[PDB]
Subunit: 377 residues, 5 copies
């Protein structure tokens, strides 16, 4: 009875094209915020951020005011899209094909004229994804909201702190915070200034997932490659092991490619580690060729270098604590074999040490390594 | 004749914005339920659940009442979207790009003003998937339905038990149940409390596909890896087999990885078992390299250590001219390589059987999964 | 001229929300059928069927009638969605994200009030796919159509048979038929019974494509694996061959898993075939490890058992019409060769026997080889 | 001033549902054509053709006529969707999820009443793709256009020759033409005939892309397989080479399989060529096994067969101009090695002949192959 | 209060179908431009360009004018889609399924009647991604905008320079510029010429990514192939390493064919380079078989020719500074064959290395944009 009358009376002469201000010269103050419900996807390959966001817009409509005493029990009213004025706040740095992922819901208006509009939306936003420190990366993704057509002279956008109470954790990204900033920017379209509210979601990738799927396995497979230098040369599988492991390590980097944006702004940390790892094992094959070349050096062929004869069978042999014509061929060849064995032991120490130092050096360079090991392991 | 008059009479002064109550201070009782016709997909990667559902919403419109005696033969009427008041009951935890996958069908009203609205939909809901027990995992996915802008003071949402009569089994997911719970939450936006209807779909994965397509094949590939310790050393291909099988076992992790999300909440059981299997194969390859070093040992190198000469050639063995004399030392080494192979075959077999069983029987749902599915 | 008059007359006091019957008690007979223009996809992984369908709905509208003598030359009118009552006939089992893939077109009414409505559509239906016999399957995919909000007491659905005159061949599926049936079923929601029409599209998979790209190719790589037995053991690559071919067979299995649903209601015939190929090639690897063990036997190890002696190197050799340390090893190398032969014949009969049975156990096999080869 | 008058005057009593004719008994003549702007994609796997088209629909509205003298400077008017009658000319064999991909634009009407409607669209269209001669294939994709609900008695559809002046090439297909055909067809629904206009886009594939990516790499890697025969037997890597080559020659069959539909009407030419190649390579593996059986033959085994002694060591040995107890063993085994060696060289030439013959024959079985090599190479 | 009055007065008799000119015979001047906010994607495979674009259309509506003195504080009004006349400027060469990705926003009209309309949009345009010089490639994508139904007689389209003010860098594409051009062309449909504004965004590819993912790895794994010529023959592993490397060189080229279109207009630089290295490594495999023929050469086989005995063991040997009785003769003869095998290994190492150096460097510098690419990205 009374609610029918109110709906009939609130829409008499009401024009949804009119900014609902009593004085036209004063700007309308609209309080903007958002509730970040979930970070569903951070598409690093496309540099996109898909998030479930409930925007919160509250303002004061001068025309939708009534006595609750004269309309008993009617304390709130609801209006749909297109029957009431609404602020045309839009996400400037959108990546969504329709550019407006917001789902239009009712606006709730109470008797003092205060209108409240909370449209849910799967907002897809264009974010610069800094992949320098991946996986140990902290992203600062900006969500920039502002009126598309109303400037500061008309629509006085005002911040309110973002809600995280209803946030459901992701599992891959650990929300560090969502600080917001209100600025009054000038654009080359227009002379009227435009205010905006930018929320910088600061997300810390939890590293257990890719710590284990990508980095730990690479290290153990690179260790499998180091076994090459203990394999006896006469086995015949010295290099097979080296080349087969190498293709296993390539499938790890093809998988990084599946997610890495096509940018050239910087070299991701993991790429540096895999690049250094691959070259180290690639160099393992090279020294493998040389030790085999030494192992098989024709007996009758040109005698051994004196330098070699000291640098491997006198000094390096002692450091590591190792110690008829056909017979001399076997004796000369056996010395070639002994040099080969010493080079095998030498390069194991050196490539193992180079692997260890390289591994920690590249990994420990990340300012998030200490943090990530502390929280995520 | 009468149907035309009824339709013309029911839309006089009707306001689809008005809540169709007689007393404005009392709320409107809306009975909510759903019929889960199917569970179409469970995208563990995007953490989404695609289900075919018919929402059921039944209430009373005070204004769409007619006395049937005067309208003979017109027992019901039908109204489309935007001509009748409807409760804006949305899925809060929606993961659909439009956020409302519901299809707006008609509202059927009988003469007592009772309205019935059953929109079909393919709902995408944002589910936390607990992947710790994968594949022997049970999921509790919530579908939380509520009026977006009507609090309890206006719309008294009341749950009715879910229907599964027409449910079409999925083949991967055995509907364990769809227990529901109502509630009256409070939001930071607003002071008026808001009620909601949460159905916690309880789904048990059916473990035959993933049992036979990944877990069992992985066991047999690890067995092919174990085969190394039965190969004669002189064959010249111990390492070839060992490494071609270690790299092959990665395949399974690629498929496991393209199905499972990238959360760091926990380590999936499938991941633990595959990691243990690959680590066992890697330790087999390492043992293989020590065996090859023993086998291809230069006779004029070091003398055989006493510890080695008893721990391998005497105890384990019992439990289970210069060229000539050089041949015999190298012979001893070949025997020691054989003893290490046999000892390590036994030990690696025991760990594989233990590890896989120990890991698989760690799942609370393993016994039920095996008995019901295999 | 007469069009303007008829179109103005036919819409006076017309309410599209009014089922168009003269008497409100009797039901409205709506004839439903469909034209199946193509089977675009059978997404087996998703258990969905995507089809080109022209639904065919005919009924009679009491109010939309006239005298052609008073509107000469005006023998039909057409109305767009929104201005004429229409049966809300939906596909209940619809997998499309929208739930109504129908494209809304005009309703054509002739002067006796008979309205004809043929909306085209790309219909995705949630179909259960019976994969036990894949690739020799006969999918019975159901398209269940009916009014969403009119019961039998109000809308008397009736079904004419489906059209296939314009049906285009698919190349993967032979339309075995599209029979239909009317079913007046009761729902737990409501007491008024609701009629539905179900068209059971019966599709026979043309097995030449898959047979050529999955089954036949596998047989030959399994034979390639069997060639291990007859390699001389001195070559040095017996297990190399075995392991390579067995990995390739895994390539095949990954493909067939890319195309087979994730269902525990049965095991596809194809899966059982690859599982048994790789099982046999696995046991080829095992017996070849035993063979190498025999070949690389230490002459100073154990003496040959009389069982190993007469079983393998007397009787088994006999049938197949085939210095001391070298002699002892020579006896051992001959053991490897007889195991090589014996295993061939034995594994070969398995190879041939198994497949033929796994394959010929499908009821559709004879038809498949006769029609698709 | 006058444009407002004319727009206000052309909407008096107008009904967008009326067929705009003076006499209700004579059919309206609609001239239909299309401008094919680009063939954006040919989804062979889905049997779909995605094309950029500007359909051209021209007719005469009896009611939208004025004299430009009374409305000076107003020679044309424009009406958007839902305000003017437009023919419901759809694409019968459409594959788009929404069926009508046309983007609805304005209808331009001049003073004499002639209306012109050129809506752009991305028309997905079910095309039977004959893959028998792929990559050397010519496709005839039909776009069948017609009025959905007007028969020949109401809408007399008429053909205007298609436009390809503004066609920009595709890069994968060479437009042979787009000849049309107007038919008057009867349907099982109804008695009234329906005229339709069918354009048969004829496309010739440009084969250099697949020519260099799928074809020549197969010939090359196959020659690399044939190198197996020239290795000496003692290397101990013949079998590994053959299998490595074959399992990697399977790469191209899983790759081409990524694009072709699952049709069983016929067998693709590329598939026939790959199958022949694989049969030849597998037979090379088989003969490699036989050659190793010859080479690693125990001397004390069976005696050399007489037929073997002659067919290899006497006739073939001359066709290719080839030529104590322990001592006899290598002599017998040396005959076996020459037997193995003559077989290797013989079969090298024989398998080589099969490769060139099979490749040339199979490739030359495509009728337009001569045109292909003359235009794309 | 006054804004209600103005909105009620501006729509009295207004018709959104009418072009808002006072003189019907004079074309309406529409100033068109755009702001390029991001190059969201360049899909070379599908031949598409996805861009974040804010179009700018400005014109003068004769009917939406008022003096602000009579409407104090109301200096600007805003009309949504379907309430005000708007220019139907579409993107001709669009590849979007709906053909028009523009998001319809309000039109802002100030007190002098000047209307300004800035619809944002994720525009998908059908581009000719020339790919002969990939990865050192410069792409010219044209975005042609123009009224779909109005010619130069009714709507005088006028270009305004484009902007890159808020161009958010992409990381893969260095925007070289967005020069525009206004043309007046005739079409086979009509007798009225239709003006258009074509913006030709020129984008240079930053080659660091695909340079170290494809160009460089190939060089290093091809070096691994070259290692075959250093392997001793006695190891009996030359063929394994050679073939395994040459099979692992196709994985990259499969990703190379996963990004670039299947066009047959030109052969990409990357494809030429990959073919050249693949031919060189395959020739390494062929030579590996030949040297193995030399190495495992039966001593009782064919006698050494006097050409191979001088062309390898005398001249080419001298260049590189290499330096029971029946069995001894047999082993000595085989050792000459083994020596011949070694000389061919060393020669082919040098020859294939030089052919790799030349081929790699020459082909890579054949791109016009190579010096600039290496100078900016390294
Ligand atoms: C409405 O807006 C237009 C454009 O913003 C204004 O016209 C411009 O005014 C500036 C200021 O002097 C001039 O420099 C430009 O040359 C003008 N351009 C055009 C196309 O007119 C116009 O003045 C504004 N109206 C009012 C009442 O301020
Ligand atoms: C390609 O090769 C691999 C790929 C992998 O995934 C992408 C993994 N993944 C893995 O080890 N994941 C684990 C381990 C544990 C415990 O939990 N998750 C391993 C290899 Cl070798
Ligand atoms: C890589 O290696 C494999 C991969 C596989 O798929 C991913 C399977 N799959 C399999 O065995 N699937 C079955 C068996 C039966 C019966 O039913 N489905 C096997 C291997 Cl070896
Ligand atoms: C992985 O390995 C293969 C994969 C294949 O496709 C999926 C095929 N396909 C094939 O042989 N297709 C043919 C043959 C003929 C004649 O026609 N189509 C073969 C192998 Cl080996
Ligand atoms: C298939 O084989 C590879 C594939 C690759 O990616 C596609 C890479 N990629 C790579 O090296 N990327 C780097 C290196 C550094 C430093 O930074 N990014 C390497 C190989 Cl071997
Ligand atoms: C409906 O109409 C009949 C006929 O006049 C009347 O007797 C009956 O009381 C009416 N129903 C109600 C609830 O008043
Ligand atoms: C319709 O009108 C005509 C005259 O216009 C009349 O002859 C005819 O009888 C009417 N209806 C019938 C019964 O066909
Ligand atoms: C238009 O006006 C001219 C001049 O008054 C007249 O000659 C001509 O016939 C008119 N055309 C029409 C609408 O018949
Ligand atoms: C607008 O009003 C002012 C004062 O009310 C008047 O002086 C002016 O002339 C008016 N505008 C025009 C264009 O005349
Ligand atoms: Ca890219």
């Amino acid at each position: 009875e009374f609610q029918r009358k109110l709906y009939k009376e609130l829409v008499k002469n009401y024009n949804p094209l009119e900014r609902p201000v009593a004085n036209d010269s004063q700007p309308l103050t609209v309080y903007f915020s958002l509730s970040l419900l979930q970070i569903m996807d951070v598409d690093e390959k496309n540099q996109v951020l898909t998030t479930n966001i409930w925007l919160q817009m509250s303002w004061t409509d001068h025309y939708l005011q009534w006595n609750v005493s004269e309309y008993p029990g009617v304390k709130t009213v609801r209006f749909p899209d297109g029957q009431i004025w609404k602020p045309d706040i839009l996400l400037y740095n959108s990546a969504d094909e329709r550019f407006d992922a917001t789902f239009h819901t009712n606006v709730l208006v109470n008797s003092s004229g205060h209108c409240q509009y909370l449209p849910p939306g799967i907002f897809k936003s264009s974010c610069y994804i800094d992949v320098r420190w991946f996986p140990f990366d902290v992203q600062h993704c900006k969500l920039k909201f502002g009126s598309w057509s109303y400037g500061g002279w008309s629509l006085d956008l005002q911040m309110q702190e973002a809600d995280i109470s209803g946030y459901i954790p992701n599992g891959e990204w650990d929300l560090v915070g969502i600080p917001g900033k209100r600025s009054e920017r000038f654009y080359e379209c227009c002379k009227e200034p435009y205010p905006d509210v930018t929320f910088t979601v600061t997300m810390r990738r939890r590293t257990l997932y890719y710590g284990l799927n990508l980095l730990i396995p690479c290290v153990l497979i690179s260790a499998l490659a180091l076994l090459v230098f203990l394999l006896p040369a006469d086995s015949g599988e010295k290099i097979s092991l080296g080349i087969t492991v190498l293709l296993s390590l390539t499938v790890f980097m093809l998988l990084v490619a599946e997610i890495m944006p096509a940018t050239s702004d910087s070299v991701p940390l993991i790429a540096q580690y895999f690049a250094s790892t691959m070259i180290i094992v690639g160099l393992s094959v090279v020294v493998t060729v040389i030790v085999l070349q030494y192992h098989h050096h024709d007996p009758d062929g040109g005698k051994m270098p004196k330098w070699t004869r000291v640098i491997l069978l006198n000094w390096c042999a002692w450091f590591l604590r190792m110690k008829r014509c056909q017979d001399e061929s076997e004796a000369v060849c056996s010395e070639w074999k002994f040099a080969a064995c010493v080079v095998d032991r030498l390069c194991l120490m050196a490539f193992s040490v180079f692997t260890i130092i390289c591994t920690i050096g590249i990994l420990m360079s990340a300012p998030n390594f200490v943090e990530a090991v502390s929280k995520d392991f």
